[PDB]
Amino acid sequence: PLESQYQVGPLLGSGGFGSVYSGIRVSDNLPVAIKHVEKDRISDWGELPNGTRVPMEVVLLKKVSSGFSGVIRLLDWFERPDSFVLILERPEPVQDLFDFITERGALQEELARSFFWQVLEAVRHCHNCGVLHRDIKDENILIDLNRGELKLIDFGSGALLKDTVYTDFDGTRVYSPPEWIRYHRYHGRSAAVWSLGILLYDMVCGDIPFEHDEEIIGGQVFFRQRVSSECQHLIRWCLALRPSDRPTFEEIQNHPWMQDVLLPQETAEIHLH
């Protein structure tokens, strides 16, 4: 049963990802999030290794939820006549990065460095587990405010990672790359790097760099805030118009701006506590 295993609390939010409620696991008081997604609202279906038909979101979450990582882990799931219910980790206290940036404005580079590094490690984890998220953005990143740890959420736009071209996309448009906008074609890793460029700009400038399609394909990055030249360079590199001119994850992590990152705990001590 579901309602005997979890004590449901208040609604935490709702949107494209479904509706998510605060919850606690009765058996040990572990805080959880209880996410409900209507079946009629799910367009991407997959199958478990044992061949059950589940949302692709569940398939991808299982693939990345083994062992420790910077991803919010799937702890369990249930099928209902008209919906699926997903039981997910819930850090406490917690705030999503969009809300955090909205509140605090542009982030100091030291904090952006630590956050961006954790997001890169998390996205590497997903790719290594065969999962492409396709909707990396500030709204899909949770911050554990006491531990200083960032966690990825919302795989409902994701796909199994592959080496061939993707011709479908339902993630967030202003984070999508110019090759998608123009040709409706992209490859997974280089499109991911583009979204990470958008995210890094957002962190250090307090807002995203592009709004309209013609801005995305023009790819001119204007800085509205004071940003170091090394950070500017890395951002412009991730936002290269040609996918092949973009850095690899290895190249991003070896870039001079990414050196000497704070650990999560010191990040929280300095910036979040």
Author numbering: 33 to 305
Can you provide the manuscript's text about this entry?
Pim kinases are interesting targets for cancer therapy as they are overexpressed in various human cancers, associated with metastasis, and overall treatment response. Our laboratory contributed to this area of research by demonstrating that substitutionally inert ruthenium(II), osmium(II), rhodium(III), iridium(III), and platinum(II) complexes can serve as highly selective and potent ATP-competitive inhibitors for protein kinases and lipid kinases. Here we now wish to report such a novel cyclometalated protein kinase inhibitor scaffold based on 1,8-phenanthrolin-7(8 H)-one cyclometalated with the half-sandwich moiety [Ru(η5-C5H5)(CO)] in a bidentate fashion. In conclusion, we here introduced a new organometallic protein kinase inhibitor scaffold based on a cyclometalated 1,8-phenanthrolin-7(8 H)-one ligand.
Because of the structural homology of the isoforms Pim1 and Pim2 and our experience with the crystallization of Pim1,[15, 19, 21b, 22b] we cocrystallized 1 with the protein kinase Pim1. The structure of the Pim1/1 complex was determined and refined to a resolution of 1.95 Å. The overall structure shows the typical two-lobe protein kinase architecture connected by a so-called hinge region, and the catalytic ATP binding site positioned in a deep intervening cleft, where one enantiomer of the ruthenium complex 1 is located. Unexpectedly, no hydrogen bonds of 1 with the hinge region are observed but instead with amino acid residues, which are located at the opposite site of the active site that is responsible for interacting with the triphosphate unit of ATP directly and mediated through magnesium(II) ions. The amide moiety of organometallic 1 forms a hydrogen bond between the lactam NH of 1 and the carboxylate group of Asp186, an amino acid residue that is part of the DFG loop having the role to bind a magnesium(II) ion during ATP activation. The lactam NH group additionally undergoes a water-mediated contact with the backbone NH group of Asp186. Another hydrogen bond is observed between the carbonyl group of organometallic 1 and the ammonium moiety of the conserved Lys67, an amino acid residue that directly interacts with the α-phosphate of ATP during phospho transfer catalysis. The phenanthroline ligand as well as the η5-C5H5 and the CO ligand of organometallic 1 form a number of hydrophobic contacts, most notably with Leu44, Phe49, Val52, Leu174, and Ile185. Related non-hinge hydrogen-bonding interactions have been observed with organic Pim1 inhibitors. Thus, the cyclometalated 1,8-phenanthrolin-7(8 H)-one 1 may constitute an attractive scaffold for the design of protein kinase inhibitors with novel properties.
